[PDB]
Amino acid sequence: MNLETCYVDFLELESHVINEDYLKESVELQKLISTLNESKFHLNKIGIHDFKRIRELQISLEDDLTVFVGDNGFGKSTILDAIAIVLSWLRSNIEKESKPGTYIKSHEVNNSVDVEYASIDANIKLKDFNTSILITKAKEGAYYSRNNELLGVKKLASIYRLVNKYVDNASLPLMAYYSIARSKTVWSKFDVYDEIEFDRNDFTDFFQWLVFLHNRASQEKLSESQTTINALFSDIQSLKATLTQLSASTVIKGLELSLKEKLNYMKSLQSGEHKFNNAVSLYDSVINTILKFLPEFQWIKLVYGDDDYKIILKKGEVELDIQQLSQGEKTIFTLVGDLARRLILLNPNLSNPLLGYGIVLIDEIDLHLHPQWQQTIIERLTSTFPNVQFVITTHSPQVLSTVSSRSVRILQEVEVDGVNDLIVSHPDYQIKGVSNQDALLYGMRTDPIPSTKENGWLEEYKKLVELNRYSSDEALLLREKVIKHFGLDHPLVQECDDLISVLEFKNKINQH
């Protein structure tokens, strides 16, 4: 079932039938929706030409997770900004046809003498349907690469506009970008979908949003809804009072009246609008999502005390104020809260909205995190949302030890034909489950042992020992400094003494 084949025939059927209701319920629409929901959205390839430090490069992305590792000034943030540029145009076209996106800044072009223009290319694969978008800008070159090729993305935008125009409560892809410091339409909730960029360490705003949402949720539980539950408070009672205690023809006659009352009570529920993610349903779903992300807590609730009000979290047998949390936990709290907020609103039809599709970009995930937190963030992220594609850049070797070797890319700098250009390599071993220093050495190509001055005497003493010159006066003099700095019981000294004894025994045997 190709997307194009279903799309063309549905368009023809829509053109043939003037009546909207005739085509509203038909096999063509069901076929299109069914084949659309099974497709998995994910980017496939990207190419960069004359953008910032990058001269010419092509990158292939995985389907579930991809981690970029490198030093400073190696274009890690360039790749993420390129993808954000590509996705901006698609978002603008989805919102409205023929809408400008984000242009390339003039200062972002390479400063080399012979450069003329900068181009960005991308490929989006949806099951079998494929598309490609190229955006280019020339600073001063006489010849340019014509204009941006937006033909491929307009067909996809029109597909989404068509599907969501006829059938409501549809689904849309998720695009988010958690950047670095730098610096109608479901607006009732106050969440803003217009801005792709979002910033962490804004716990105050999310705290106020949660409080206001809770107040609206509590308000909706009263008034007319309290009347409907009151009716249900008697129909079920009548059912029990007529069929439980008197089991042991006028008695049976009341059962008809009770069933009539139940059917009449069904009239009020019949005259009720769809939930459409009302205030009540959003709150519990968000709270349960956060509880699922962090299983160390029992429950979270807002308590209005005799004079104050605060949010209380319970773990084990201790209750902690929300403000007592450290900076790392606050950052995790707001990151997961924002992700859950977007996912719930974008998928109002699914029973479990945590199974949506989209792409999420995170830059410097290990910011403001203790080493004990860094060793479990990836597993939880990849387990809470199992149908999202992640692109992550990191600096900490502790995170690398929890990532499979098939999702690691290393950026280096090599010179070919007199021109220095970036290059992408892969680790040569398996780095999942290895120690911290093994991961640093293999996944980052750095010396795990410092080159301090105090180390300088250590290798000299070792070398003198290995050359069977440990009895020399120079070795005796150097041992005083080493033993003074480290101490007798340090394991490094212990192994040196073991080597001394082994060599002494070998010399004794050889002498005899």
Ligand X SMILES: Nc1ncnc2c1ncn2[C@@H]1O[C@H](COP(=O)(O)OP(=O)(O)OP(=O)(O)O)[C@@H](O)[C@H]1O
DSSP per residue over 52-109, as a string? TTEEEEEEE--SSEEEEE--TTSSHHHHHHHHHHHHHHHHHHHHSSS----PPPGGGB
Axis-axis angle for helices 3-16, 151-166 (nearest 10): 60
- Shortest distance (Å) from residue 315 CB to other proteins: 23
Closest CA to 152 of 89, 88, 61: 89
110 interacts with, out of ligand X, other proteins, none, CB within 5 to 8 A per kind: ligand X
77 known member of a binding site: yes
228 lies in the site for other proteins, by CB under 8 A:
no
Q: Put the strands of the sheet holding 197-198 in their side by side order.
A: 197-198, 174-178, 358-363, 388-393, 65-69, 408-416, 419-425
- Shortest distance (Å) from residue 99 CB to other proteins: 38
Contact 109, 137 (CB under 8 A): yes
- Shortest distance (Å) from residue 233 CB to other proteins: 5
129 known member of a binding site: no
Nearer to ligand X, 50 or 62 (CB): 50
- Shortest distance (Å) from residue 72 CB to ligand X: 4
DSSP-derived pairing of the beta strands 174-178 and 65-69: unpaired
246 interacts with, out of ligand X, other proteins, none, CB within 5 to 8 A per kind: other proteins
- Shortest distance (Å) from residue 411 CB to ligand X: 8
Closest CA to 79 of 106, 56, 46, 103: 46
237 lies in the site for other proteins, by CB under 8 A:
yes
Q: Find the angle CA(277)-CA(203)-CA(209) to the nearest 5 degrees.
A: 30
Amino acid letter for position 178: Y
34 interacts with, out of other proteins, ligand X, none, CB within 5 to 8 A per kind: none
Judged by CB under 8 A, the residue of 72, 106, 188, 245 near other proteins is 245
Let me know how long the chain is.
Answer: 512
As a whole number of angstroms, the distance between CA 69 and CA 47 comes to 19
307 lies in the site for other proteins, by CB under 8 A:
yes
241 lies in the site for other proteins, by CB under 8 A:
yes
Query: Which region, judged by CB under 8 A, interacts with other proteins, from 218-226, 395-403, 493-501, 502-510?
Result: 218-226
- Shortest distance (Å) from residue 245 CB to other proteins: 5
Closest CA to 28 of 5, 57, 60: 5
- Shortest distance (Å) from residue 210 CB to other proteins: 13
Residue 140: partners with Cβ closer than 8 Å, 6 or more residues away: 116
Gap between the terminal Cα atoms of the chain: 87
Query: How many angstroms from the chain centroid is the CA of residue 378?
Result: 9
Judged by CB under 8 A, the residue of 99, 105, 260, 310 near other proteins is 310
Judged by CB under 8 A, the residue of 72, 224, 304, 491 near other proteins is 304
111 known member of a binding site: yes
Structure tokens at 79: 């790749």
As a whole number of angstroms, the distance between CA 206 and CA 344 comes to 16
Question: Which residue has the CB atom at the shortest distance from ligand X?
Answer: 73
Q: Which residue has the tokens 């109608």?
A: 184
456 interacts with, out of other proteins, ligand X, none, CB within 5 to 8 A per kind: none
Structure tokens at 341: 């907020």
Residues forming contacts to ligand X in the complex (CB under 6 A) are: 52-53, 72-78, 110-111, 180
Nearer to ligand X, 288 or 420 (CB): 420
326 known member of a binding site: yes
Taking CB under 8 A as the rule, which mask of x and - marks residues 161-200 in contact with other proteins?
----------------------------------------
260 lies in the site for other proteins, by CB under 8 A:
no
125 known member of a binding site: no
452 interacts with, out of ligand X, other proteins, none, CB within 5 to 8 A per kind: none
Structure tokens at 128: 């079998």
Axis-axis angle for helices 27-37, 3-16 (nearest 10): 150
CB atoms within 10 A of CB 496: 19
Judged by CB under 8 A, the residue of 72, 183, 250, 324 near other proteins is 250
Residue ranges for the binding site? Answer: 53, 73-78, 107, 109, 111, 315, 324, 326, 329
List residues near other proteins by CB under 8 A. Answer: 208, 215, 218-219, 221-222, 230, 233-234, 237-238, 241, 245-246, 250-251, 254, 304, 307-310
| Binding-site residues for ATP | 53, 73-78, 107, 109, 111, 315, 324, 326, 329
